[PDB]
Design a protein around this ligand. Structure first.
Ligand SMILES: [Mn+2]
Length: 242
């Protein structure tokens, strides 16, 4: 009803999940100002999302996304040029406007074998905060940071969501691809791959075998390599709609 209408609104809040939205309703929380008068029942996450609800509603225009990409890119370099950083998502794909900033990151020091180098990620983030770019944090793991950011006003920009993922270097390309999408693109590709006797996921590419249940990840030093495994011409990001 006009109330379910409430669970619907809430959920429109980054952090506000359903079961998470649900309870707040049993607490008498329905509208937003309801929320502002009730930070205390909210986590840090939900809290931030509420804090920026509006801005979060806006799309990011590629002119913006661009500068955003320059900043993140030139900072990560100054820390350690052995650092690899790829802004994925629809934008990578030429998209005109984007929802958020999805940053993929890796380092030679870090591989799927190590599995423990928080500092690697942390470091960058820190660097950005210092820069005044990242502005808040919703969540922050050893391998994945999710937060807020904002272009440097010279006078002001909205706050954009931004994500960072630390990927082991030997799994990174499968990753860029995967995070590059579209979803169809991926679906089709995984479908083809299958024909070719290959299994693909956001992490690896693995030859199959009898009965089908098989694997043993092949080496990937670039996206191209994937296309090569399954011997398909290489599609640049743009021609990736499907
Ligand atoms: Mn994202």
């Amino acid at each position: 009803d006009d109330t379910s209408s409430s669970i619907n609104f809430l959920t429109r809040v980054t952090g506000i999940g359903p079961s998470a939205a649900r309870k707040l309703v049993d607490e008498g929380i329905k509208t937003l100002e309801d929320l502002r008068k009730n930070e205390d029942k909210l986590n840090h996450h939900q809290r931030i999302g509420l804090k920026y609800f509006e801005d979060f509603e806006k799309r990011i225009p590629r002119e913006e996304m661009l500068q955003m990409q320059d900043i993140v890119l030139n900072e990560v370099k100054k820390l350690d040029p052995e650092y690899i950083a790829t802004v994925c998502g629809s934008f990578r794909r030429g998209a005109e406007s984007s929802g958020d900033m999805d940053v993929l990151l890796t380092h030679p020091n870090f591989t799927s074998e190590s599995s423990k180098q928080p500092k690697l990620l942390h470091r960058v983030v820190e660097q950005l905060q210092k820069v005044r770019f990242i502005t808040d944090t919703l969540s922050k793991g050893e391998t994945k940071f999710m937060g807020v950011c904002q272009l440097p006003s010279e006078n002001e920009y909205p706050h954009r969501r931004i994500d960072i993922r630390l990927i082991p270097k030997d799994q990174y390309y499968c990753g860029v691809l995967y995070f590059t999408g579209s979803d169809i693109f991926n679906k089709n590709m995984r479908a083809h791959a299958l024909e070719k006797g290959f299994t693909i996921n956001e992490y690896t590419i693995r030859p199959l075998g009898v009965t089908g249940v098989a694997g043993e990840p092949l080496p990937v030093d670039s996206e191209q390599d994937i296309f090569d495994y399954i011997q398909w011409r290489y599609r640049e990001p743009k021609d990736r709609s499907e």
